[PDB]
Design a protein around this motif. Sequence first.
Motif, PDB file in Angstrom:
ATOM      1  N   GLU A   1       0.788  -1.251  -0.140  1.00  0.00           N
ATOM      2  CA  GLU A   1       0.093  -0.063   0.029  1.00  0.00           C
ATOM      3  C   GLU A   1       0.823   1.328  -0.209  1.00  0.00           C
ATOM      4  OE1 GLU A   1      -3.276  -0.662   2.560  1.00  0.00           O
ATOM      5  OE2 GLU A   1      -3.457   1.644   2.976  1.00  0.00           O
TER       6      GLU A   1
ATOM      7  N   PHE B   1     -23.229  19.976   8.672  1.00  0.00           N
ATOM      8  CA  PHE B   1     -21.947  20.551   8.144  1.00  0.00           C
ATOM      9  C   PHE B   1     -21.449  20.831   6.652  1.00  0.00           C
ATOM     10  CE2 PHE B   1     -19.795  16.425   7.574  1.00  0.00           C
ATOM     11  CZ  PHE B   1     -20.728  15.785   8.440  1.00  0.00           C
TER      12      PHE B   1
ATOM     13  N   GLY C   1     -19.428   4.041   1.411  1.00  0.00           N
ATOM     14  CA  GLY C   1     -18.288   4.173   2.430  1.00  0.00           C
ATOM     15  C   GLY C   1     -17.849   2.968   3.337  1.00  0.00           C
TER      16      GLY C   1
ATOM     17  N   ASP D   1     -14.163   0.465   3.008  1.00  0.00           N
ATOM     18  CA  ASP D   1     -13.280   0.365   4.276  1.00  0.00           C
ATOM     19  C   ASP D   1     -12.463  -0.943   4.256  1.00  0.00           C
ATOM     20  OD1 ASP D   1     -12.861  -0.439   7.005  1.00  0.00           O
ATOM     21  OD2 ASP D   1     -14.427   0.909   7.494  1.00  0.00           O
ATOM     22  N   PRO D   2     -11.492  -0.852   4.451  1.00  0.00           N
ATOM     23  CA  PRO D   2     -10.232  -1.827   4.106  1.00  0.00           C
ATOM     24  C   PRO D   2     -10.132  -2.861   5.662  1.00  0.00           C
ATOM     25  CG  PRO D   2      -9.128  -0.022   4.794  1.00  0.00           C
ATOM     26  CD  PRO D   2     -10.433   0.339   4.737  1.00  0.00           C
TER      27      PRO D   2
ATOM     28  N   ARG E   1     -13.997  -3.928  10.114  1.00  0.00           N
ATOM     29  CA  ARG E   1     -15.225  -3.126  10.716  1.00  0.00           C
ATOM     30  C   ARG E   1     -16.244  -3.103   9.542  1.00  0.00           C
ATOM     31  NH1 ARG E   1     -16.225   1.959   8.993  1.00  0.00           N
ATOM     32  NH2 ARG E   1     -17.609   3.353  10.222  1.00  0.00           N
TER      33      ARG E   1
ATOM     34  N   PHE F   1     -24.116  15.099  14.244  1.00  0.00           N
ATOM     35  CA  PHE F   1     -23.165  13.814  14.475  1.00  0.00           C
ATOM     36  C   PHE F   1     -24.127  12.492  14.234  1.00  0.00           C
ATOM     37  CE2 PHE F   1     -19.024  14.827  15.613  1.00  0.00           C
ATOM     38  CZ  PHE F   1     -18.957  16.179  15.860  1.00  0.00           C
TER      39      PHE F   1
ATOM     40  N   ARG G   1      -8.799   6.918  14.749  1.00  0.00           N
ATOM     41  CA  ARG G   1      -8.102   5.592  14.653  1.00  0.00           C
ATOM     42  C   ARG G   1      -8.983   4.373  14.840  1.00  0.00           C
ATOM     43  NH1 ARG G   1      -5.508   8.950  18.010  1.00  0.00           N
ATOM     44  NH2 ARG G   1      -3.676  10.067  16.940  1.00  0.00           N
ATOM     45  N   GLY G   2     -10.150   4.687  14.803  1.00  0.00           N
ATOM     46  CA  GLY G   2     -11.428   3.646  15.225  1.00  0.00           C
ATOM     47  C   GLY G   2     -11.797   3.560  16.528  1.00  0.00           C
TER      48      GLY G   2
ATOM     49  N   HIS H   1     -12.675  11.219   7.248  1.00  0.00           N
ATOM     50  CA  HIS H   1     -13.364  11.984   8.156  1.00  0.00           C
ATOM     51  C   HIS H   1     -13.672  13.222   7.337  1.00  0.00           C
ATOM     52  CE1 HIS H   1     -12.626   8.921  10.991  1.00  0.00           C
ATOM     53  NE2 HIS H   1     -11.480   9.098  11.357  1.00  0.00           N
ATOM     54  N   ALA H   2     -14.163  14.132   8.204  1.00  0.00           N
ATOM     55  CA  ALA H   2     -14.753  15.498   7.433  1.00  0.00           C
ATOM     56  C   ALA H   2     -14.348  16.700   8.582  1.00  0.00           C
ATOM     57  CB  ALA H   2     -16.398  15.725   7.218  1.00  0.00           C
TER      58      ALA H   2
ATOM     59  N   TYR I   1     -15.899  15.574  12.397  1.00  0.00           N
ATOM     60  CA  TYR I   1     -17.170  14.675  11.881  1.00  0.00           C
ATOM     61  C   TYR I   1     -16.501  13.282  11.344  1.00  0.00           C
ATOM     62  CZ  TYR I   1     -19.200  19.117  11.941  1.00  0.00           C
ATOM     63  OH  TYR I   1     -19.409  20.653  12.333  1.00  0.00           O
ATOM     64  N   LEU I   2     -16.685  12.259  12.043  1.00  0.00           N
ATOM     65  CA  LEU I   2     -16.214  10.910  11.780  1.00  0.00           C
ATOM     66  C   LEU I   2     -17.085  10.443  10.588  1.00  0.00           C
ATOM     67  CD1 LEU I   2     -15.569   9.411  15.304  1.00  0.00           C
ATOM     68  CD2 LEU I   2     -13.938  10.845  14.004  1.00  0.00           C
ATOM     69  N   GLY I   3     -16.590  10.058   9.798  1.00  0.00           N
ATOM     70  CA  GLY I   3     -17.165   9.316   8.466  1.00  0.00           C
ATOM     71  C   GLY I   3     -16.666   8.278   8.173  1.00  0.00           C
ATOM     72  N   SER I   4     -16.468   8.008   6.457  1.00  0.00           N
ATOM     73  CA  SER I   4     -16.105   6.788   5.978  1.00  0.00           C
ATOM     74  C   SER I   4     -14.819   6.477   6.822  1.00  0.00           C
ATOM     75  CB  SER I   4     -15.822   6.886   4.834  1.00  0.00           C
ATOM     76  OG  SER I   4     -17.210   6.661   3.919  1.00  0.00           O
ATOM     77  N   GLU I   5     -14.370   5.396   7.032  1.00  0.00           N
ATOM     78  CA  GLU I   5     -13.148   4.863   7.490  1.00  0.00           C
ATOM     79  C   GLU I   5     -12.355   4.372   6.401  1.00  0.00           C
ATOM     80  OE1 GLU I   5     -13.337   5.864  11.958  1.00  0.00           O
ATOM     81  OE2 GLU I   5     -11.631   5.138  10.606  1.00  0.00           O
ATOM     82  N   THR I   6     -11.011   4.820   6.322  1.00  0.00           N
ATOM     83  CA  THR I   6      -9.886   4.498   5.318  1.00  0.00           C
ATOM     84  C   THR I   6      -8.900   3.982   6.278  1.00  0.00           C
ATOM     85  OG1 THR I   6      -9.057   6.621   4.967  1.00  0.00           O
ATOM     86  CG2 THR I   6     -10.776   6.078   3.769  1.00  0.00           C
ATOM     87  N   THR I   7      -7.876   3.401   5.831  1.00  0.00           N
ATOM     88  CA  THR I   7      -6.677   3.001   6.293  1.00  0.00           C
ATOM     89  C   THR I   7      -5.963   3.965   6.960  1.00  0.00           C
ATOM     90  OG1 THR I   7      -4.358   2.367   5.642  1.00  0.00           O
ATOM     91  CG2 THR I   7      -5.575   3.418   3.877  1.00  0.00           C
TER      92      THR I   7
ATOM     93  N   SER J   1      -7.297   6.715   8.160  1.00  0.00           N
ATOM     94  CA  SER J   1      -8.094   7.410   8.962  1.00  0.00           C
ATOM     95  C   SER J   1      -8.331   6.352  10.213  1.00  0.00           C
ATOM     96  CB  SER J   1      -9.593   7.448   8.605  1.00  0.00           C
ATOM     97  OG  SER J   1     -10.253   6.326   8.508  1.00  0.00           O
ATOM     98  N   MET J   2      -8.277   5.123  10.179  1.00  0.00           N
ATOM     99  CA  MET J   2      -8.009   3.910  11.037  1.00  0.00           C
ATOM    100  C   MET J   2      -6.521   3.850  11.846  1.00  0.00           C
ATOM    101  SD  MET J   2     -11.002   2.031  11.236  1.00  0.00           S
ATOM    102  CE  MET J   2     -10.434   1.159  12.460  1.00  0.00           C
TER     103      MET J   2
END
Lengths: 143, 732, 75, 62, 31, 35, 96, 75, 75, 80
Positions: free
Chosen positions: A29, A141, B10, B14-15, B18, B551, H54-55, J2-3, J67-73, J75-76
Amino acid sequence: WTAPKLDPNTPSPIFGGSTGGLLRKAQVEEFYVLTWEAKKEAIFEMPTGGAAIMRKGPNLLKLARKEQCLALLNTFRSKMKLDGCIYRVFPSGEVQYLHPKDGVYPEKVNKGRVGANQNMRSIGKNTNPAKIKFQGKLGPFEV
Amino acid sequence: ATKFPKFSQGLASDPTTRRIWFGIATAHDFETHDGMTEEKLYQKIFASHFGQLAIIFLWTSGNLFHVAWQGNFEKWGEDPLHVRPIAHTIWDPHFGQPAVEAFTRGGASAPVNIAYSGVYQWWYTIGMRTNVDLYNGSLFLLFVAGLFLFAGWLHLQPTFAPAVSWFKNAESRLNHHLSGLFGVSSLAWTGHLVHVAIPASRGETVRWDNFLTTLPHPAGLAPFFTGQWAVYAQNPDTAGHIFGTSEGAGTAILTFLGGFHPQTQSLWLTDMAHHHLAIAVVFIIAGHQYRTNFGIGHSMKEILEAHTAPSGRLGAGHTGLFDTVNNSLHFQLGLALASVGVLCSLTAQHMYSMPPYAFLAQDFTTQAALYSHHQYIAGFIMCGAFAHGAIFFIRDYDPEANKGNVLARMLEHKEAIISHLSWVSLFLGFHTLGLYVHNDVMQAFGTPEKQILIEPVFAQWIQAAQGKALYGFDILLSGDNAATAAGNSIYLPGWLAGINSSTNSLFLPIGPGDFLVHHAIALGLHTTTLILVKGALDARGSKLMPDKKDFGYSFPCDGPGRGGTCDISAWDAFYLAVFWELNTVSWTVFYFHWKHLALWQGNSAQFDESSTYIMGWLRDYLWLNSSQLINGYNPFGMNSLSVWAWMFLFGHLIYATGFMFLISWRGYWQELIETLVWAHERTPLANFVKWNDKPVALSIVQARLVGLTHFAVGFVLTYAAFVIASTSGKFG
Amino acid sequence: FIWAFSLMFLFSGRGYWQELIESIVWAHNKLKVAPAIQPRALSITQGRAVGVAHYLLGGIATTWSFFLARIIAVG
Amino acid sequence: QVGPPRGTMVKILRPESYWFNDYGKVISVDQTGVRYPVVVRFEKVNYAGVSTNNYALDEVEY
Amino acid sequence: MPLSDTQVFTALFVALITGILSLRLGTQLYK
Amino acid sequence: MAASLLPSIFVPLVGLVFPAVAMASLFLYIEKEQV
Amino acid sequence: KYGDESVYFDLSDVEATTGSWDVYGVDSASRYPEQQAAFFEAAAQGLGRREAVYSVLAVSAGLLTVAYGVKGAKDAKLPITVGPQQPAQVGPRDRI
Amino acid sequence: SLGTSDFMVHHIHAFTIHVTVLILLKGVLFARSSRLIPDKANLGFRFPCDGPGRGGTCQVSAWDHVFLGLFWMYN
Amino acid sequence: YPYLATDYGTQLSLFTHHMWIGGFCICGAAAHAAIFMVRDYDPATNYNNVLDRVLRHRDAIISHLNWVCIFLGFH
Amino acid sequence: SHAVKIYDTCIGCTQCVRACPTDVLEMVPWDGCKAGQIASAPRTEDCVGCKRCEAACPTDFLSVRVYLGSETTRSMGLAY
Ligand code: CLA
Ligand code: CLA
Ligand code: CLA
Ligand code: CLA
Ligand code: CLA
Ligand code: CLA
Ligand code: CLA
Ligand SMILES: CC1=C(/C=C/C(C)=C/C=C/C(C)=C/C=C/C=C(C)/C=C/C=C(C)/C=C/C2=C(C)CCCC2(C)C)C(C)(C)CCC1
Ligand SMILES: CC1=C(/C=C/C(C)=C/C=C/C(C)=C/C=C/C=C(C)/C=C/C=C(C)/C=C/C2=C(C)CCCC2(C)C)C(C)(C)CCC1
Ligand SMILES: CC1=C(C/C=C(\C)CCC[C@H](C)CCC[C@H](C)CCCC(C)C)C(=O)c2ccccc2C1=O
Ligand SMILES: CC1=C(C/C=C(\C)CCC[C@H](C)CCC[C@H](C)CCCC(C)C)C(=O)c2ccccc2C1=O
Ligand code: SF4
Ligand code: SF4
Ligand code: SF4
């Protein structure tokens, strides 16, 4: 800051190895490279774990996450008052100048930056989520 | 990207693992799906309702088929008091020979489970007698389930798919549901009872074969259409009537005797037929209230619009609430859940005291299991109602449109409501716990006469008003006045016989232990309502987090800043209130089970003595009645309660595992998984196999839910095992 | 009781309790009883600290009472 | 000079403010036409521990 | 009187058809 | 005859065969790439 | 160059930079006897396809469950297949 | 005497000890940094979390490991 | 002690007491190890010593301990 | 990812930027505040969501919101 600084093959800090280094994510990656100029040889702390010795002059360090690179650079700036830049390196072999992403640390206002993700209103002036119902909206937002 | 989150891009990108968890979790949240219009939302909801109705009918058909095929319904009907009902055969490869020889109860030749759901008493009361009748019913419900599956499929096609406005037609829906879904259904059930169930109760079997040849009443419909409706109540069943036989069997099909049938200790079937008839009439009348297509009837919008208090104490009244309810699926869902949970509580509280099924009162394990079942279902449904109202406040509430109505007024004085809920909860808990601790100490110190035993004279006074002659108030039905004189024409002799009898549970005697436990119940209800109303009213924002509506309903927190904002979301308020709901329902059903166990052993003095202090509950109820349960299996073999012992310990396991997810939080587990990822990546012969999804710890909300689910599952399974095993060990 | 009471601190979070405090502070401000020291929910670390402390207290004291009563009575 | 003079107590009208409906002393008002010129100081701290912030002219009342 | 084998198998075949219809409904929902 | 046969077939069918196929199938779909 | 002193970054040697090393793998073309290889190629001639394996396992599942419910369970003398073969017992309140 | 029950309970004891040691040693070794939070030394020994990012970074501090460590010790 | 074993209550009480004291003290030892590690640990004075190498393969230690812990519990 | 949104109540104190562990935030010139600078979030893809910016924002209510949104690598915050 005419151009971003290129990434040469500079010596890496003296380190005995650790199990906290690059995982397969670097292979599949991406991984990040931190480079900084050291005023003197000194012992710093690896963000992965353990202690390493940085070499006088330029140093190069590859780390799994941008957060590790930026934490270590912030340590260098706040303690040792050094200067450093971060690159993102993909498995295809293209690096990517990352830090500070302007040639100027973000905390210092610099000309030419354009405001991204700015809402010209207070937080309470966001509309209610019921008004954006059944719309392709992230939330109040983003309207 | 992957295909499983077909409804969520979304999550598709996600990878991590979760993705899988949140695609499972957010599957039925149709409103948050990509490219989701209101029309698709409503059509999918309609077809899902079709789907799980077909699930309900397949569940019923399965119960009927298993009782018909593997049960002992005929033999049970022969001797209802000396035959244990059979639920279904057990074919377990893991059973040993003692298990096979110990689970063979009833007259089965194979290991079986003893049906504690009351389906036998219900099906015997409705006229079903043989396995053939139950099989025919199961096959018919199989056909009904197939019909509803086909209907869901059909109304998903574009020609037959209805528009949003069809769902938004409130007047027509309520007219048809009141008249037809409620009223005509009750009329048809009355026709069943009159034509089939009552004749079967009086010995003659009236199936489809001899239907249309046996008149349900000796007179035909002449008394009906000539207005001599009192002919149908002329000759009721005799007191010395044996159910299912013709001894002392009357001819009246509809009446209001009241009380209970003496031989079955359940409601008279003629009473219940007359009951469903009256409901049918009332609801068929009620279903003409609203205006649909014929220029007559009310308009619900205008009903709400015209109900505004002139003094302005309510503000703008109900102005603007019609569109609020009709456009908000979460408002409607919260209302429907609130009502359904209240009904489920009512069924629990009325079936134990007024058993509608023949030979149900004599089967004590079924009574306990049904009461526990419906109370736990009711508590969960209530938690859902309040959660969906919080969701309504977040997603569906429009402050601009609801400006000035009672709802915006609720937002305006929410602090007063929450604070007074906190006050009543604190008062109830302080004083109830203090009185319990005081009684604990006085019993401990050997001076039980110094206990604060408050006599619950208000409930006793109600019972005296309602006919109970124990306490001697003698005011309304126990006294001799106009109310009793009016009652004593039709219903009151049977009601007084039922209520003053020591055997049944129509209105049990009340003592200071009942006072203290009802105040504990009040504590539980007030605190659960505090948590849930707080979640609903602070759903849209609070002083700690003004922009909570931006939220969504369920988010982990807003960070450690501002002192810390853990469990700040309305979802988290629900998650916290489920604990209090389980606690309250457990208190209620512990009270029920102990009081009824004391009644069923014939020594009500045990509860009346030991329910005033907590050690009495811990010793004479929990420890005392757990003896046979824990001895289900032991080093000296096993018996029929070994499965319930295993489930008891099973539920304990789940409860504890839930405690793990509730107490330990994500970030310890994330680092542990990171070390595990390193280990797997660097293990020889195991790095050949690689995960597709990056393994990560459970998210904060996810793990809160998982822990809550484990908590609740272990709670319910432990108590189900206890209430069934103890009651069956002492009574079968 | 103390063990079950610890479960309160353990299973909950600061945000809820702070908002409940906000409602209670509104009630106090209504009657001009508002303290000069502003009421605050326990910190998240303190909430965990209280939870583990009461949990250990309740569990150990339960075992203490059980063991001592049993072994003194049987002798 | 626009807005409240220095030293006066102003009632906060921002709905999201921690000190909403509370009174705070005006420290300074910026006359360079900024969006939130009114600096208001508060006896009581918010959840972040700060005792002051900025308000517009319509977010205060005196 | 136990249920005849023909009764059990007829009900089971009706169940199989009902299950097919449930699959049709599930596929239609998934669209 | 149904009583002596069908339990011994359908209990493994619903508790070992159907679970295996369902879990395998669901796995294959969930891990199936979007394209 | 990756081989230089204190240098571990090389955009030409991406594999060494990222650590993608074959630790124990060996690229020797043959280790087994050829005819043994031919036999085991023929033994798995049709099964080399994944969907062929799917059909194999579905058929095997059906045959094993049918045989277990018809003959396998009885042959193994499972207690569940053996009848209770004992007198029954009556629950409390004389409830059989 | 030491029969099979003694074997089982002693291996239980070792299990519970090893888990308590896991929690405590993980807290000590990951007290300064981790792959999740590299800059954890400057966050302090006793902090609640680093945020829901980070989750979710709850209970990352070594103090929180002593919390869970204490729990298992009790167990 | 004379007439200690015969008094079963004091013997059980002493055993249980000192067990609890021991487990608590070990948990505190972990806590203060973590406190030192965050606050008083200097990488300059610990370059390639016995502690720094532990910090350099903490992943292996924790993964093996976690594996051991799982194994032990399952069995 | 996230946003992260910046609101006009920002005073340009730079604390959000200095607190960010992934270099998501930066200061840009702006006439709205006295300090003459507003934050921005160009590199929103790198936002792990740790909300250190919100903790470090002095303005009431916050001028920076995550604002927590779609979780990517990224972001995680995964090293794997
Ligand atoms: C939802 C209702 C329901 C339930 C809970 C059960 C439960 C059970 N059945 Mg029964 N059964 C039912 C309906 C039901 N059945 C119906 C309608 C029929 C057709 C007349 C049968 C016919 C039947 C036979 C012939 C046998 C069982 C057997 C069994 C037992 C386990 C083996 C098994 O699952 O095979 C079930 C076999 C099937 C062929 C599937 C039938 C299930 C129905 C038709 C569909 C239900 C689906 C459900 C609503 C939605 C599922 C989705 C998701 C929630 C998982 C178990 C006690 C066996 C037994 O007694 O073992 C000791 C046995 O020999 N069942
Ligand atoms: C006479 C006309 C009629 C009738 C019978 C129905 C019937 C039904 N509609 Mg309605 N509907 C109608 C006209 C009608 N509709 C019209 C005109 C419209 C257009 C406006 C709609 C629009 C509509 C929508 C939009 C939906 C329905 C749905 C449903 C189903 C709901 C499930 C149900 O019955 O719960 C069971 C309820 C009862 C039998 C009544 C409840 C009584 C209380 C709660 C319980 C009392 C029970 C009693 C004491 C006995 C219990 C114990 C006993 C079992 C032992 C139901 C079959 C839903 C659906 O999709 O299902 C497929 C749905 O979403 N309908
Ligand atoms: C008629 C009733 C009804 C309806 C239509 C809905 C519908 C909805 N609810 Mg509501 N809800 C209900 C009842 C209902 N709920 C009840 C009774 C409760 C209280 C328990 C809730 C609590 C609730 C919450 C807290 C939330 C919803 C949400 C939602 C939405 C999405 C559900 C979801 O996330 O996917 C489907 C859900 C799942 C797949 C999770 C189920 C996991 C269960 C609990 C596992 C159980 C284990 C099992 C029983 C153990 C087996 C036995 C063991 C021995 C092995 C949807 C609008 C969510 C939302 O986003 O709303 C908009 C949301 O946040 N609801
Ligand atoms: C047995 C366990 C237990 C107990 C006693 C409580 C008690 C309370 N909870 Mg908690 N709670 C628990 C478990 C428990 N909870 C669990 C596991 C959960 C799930 C997370 C919750 C979730 C929860 C929420 C979400 C809410 C409550 C609320 C409340 C209050 C309800 C009002 C009331 O009854 O006041 C009476 C109070 C008590 C019985 C508390 C103990 C007071 C004692 C008796 C006085 C002690 C005096 C004595 C001198 C002490 C000596 C100590 C000395 C060494 C200093 C009360 C403080 C609600 C609240 O705050 O309402 C205002 C609320 O919002 N709780
Ligand atoms: C390890 C031990 C073990 C195992 C494997 C079993 C296994 C079984 N027992 Mg036995 N049993 C055991 C111990 C065990 N038992 C013990 C100690 C006791 C106490 C003496 C009993 C007492 C006992 C009785 C009294 C009965 C059984 C029955 C059964 C069978 C259930 C039928 C079935 O498969 O339904 C299908 C499986 C289920 C319905 C379970 C659903 C649970 C899940 C988790 C719910 C959530 C599902 C969710 C949607 C995810 C699904 C994923 C899916 C796609 C894979 C099964 C053969 C029953 C039987 O033979 O009837 C036919 C029965 O009546 N057992
Ligand atoms: C709910 C359904 C269910 C059913 C029907 C079974 C059935 C069985 N289990 Mg159980 N099991 C289940 C769930 C189930 N299991 C679950 C969920 C668990 C986890 C807790 C277990 C854990 C478990 C253990 C630990 C053991 C069993 C064993 C057994 C077998 C006992 C036979 C015997 O006496 O030895 C005689 C055994 C033989 C003669 C060998 C039979 C070998 C054939 C190939 C099995 C045929 C089964 C099946 C019909 C076909 C495959 C189905 C599917 C994979 C496609 C039997 C086949 C025992 C055993 O020996 O099984 C291997 C055993 O040791 N099971
Ligand atoms: C009874 C409750 C319970 C259980 C079972 C667990 C189980 C576990 N915890 Mg948790 N924990 C709990 C309560 C519990 N904990 C509570 C209340 C706390 C306080 C917050 C903690 C705090 C905590 C921490 C802080 C840590 C653990 C760790 C562990 C693991 C230790 C390894 C182990 O036990 O071997 C493996 C697991 C078991 C033996 C669990 C029981 C499973 C049984 C044997 C079933 C076996 C399989 C079965 C047949 C099912 C297959 C069939 C099925 C699909 C149908 C394990 C996952 C440690 C860890 O994860 O590292 C190893 C760890 O670091 N836990
Ligand atoms: C959150 C929310 C929600 C939900 C809520 C809820 C859930 C509530 C509940 C509620 C409830 C749950 C209630 C109840 C009630 C009850 C009542 C009101 C009762 C009454 C009674 C009466 C009136 C009686 C009388 C009498 C008597 C006394 C006896 C005898 C007979 C007679 C009749 C005489 C909603 C969605 C809406 C909205 C949004 C928000
Ligand atoms: C060949 C043979 C055999 C076998 C057979 C069989 C195997 C049969 C079966 C049958 C069957 C196998 C049946 C079934 C049925 C089913 C059903 C009836 C189901 C239903 C379901 C439902 C209804 C669901 C629904 C849903 C869900 C839940 C999900 C999604 C959504 C929906 C709604 C769709 C034997 C060996 C014995 C013998 C010889 C011959
Ligand atoms: C134990 C634990 C973990 C570790 C749990 C891991 C990540 C998940 C374990 C899942 C495995 C695959 C076993 C699952 C067994 C289930 C019975 C399967 C359910 C599958 C359904 C879809 C049917 C956390 O990540 C966590 C996070 C926040 C608070 C508490 C905790 C927590 O207590
Ligand atoms: C109950 C609870 C609270 C609320 C508890 C409040 C803030 C404090 C506890 C009450 C003490 C007793 C207040 C101190 C009272 C004064 C000392 C007044 C003198 C006492 C007279 C009444 C005698 C939290 O703040 C919390 C935070 C994080 C996780 C869990 C929880 C949690 O479970
Ligand atoms: S949940 Fe864990 S992380 Fe999110 S705020 Fe509360 S403590 Fe900090
Ligand atoms: S956002 Fe908060 S912190 Fe970042 S600059 Fe604007 S004000 Fe200062
Ligand atoms: S959340 Fe963490 S990363 Fe995203 S901006 Fe705020 S601080 Fe920088």
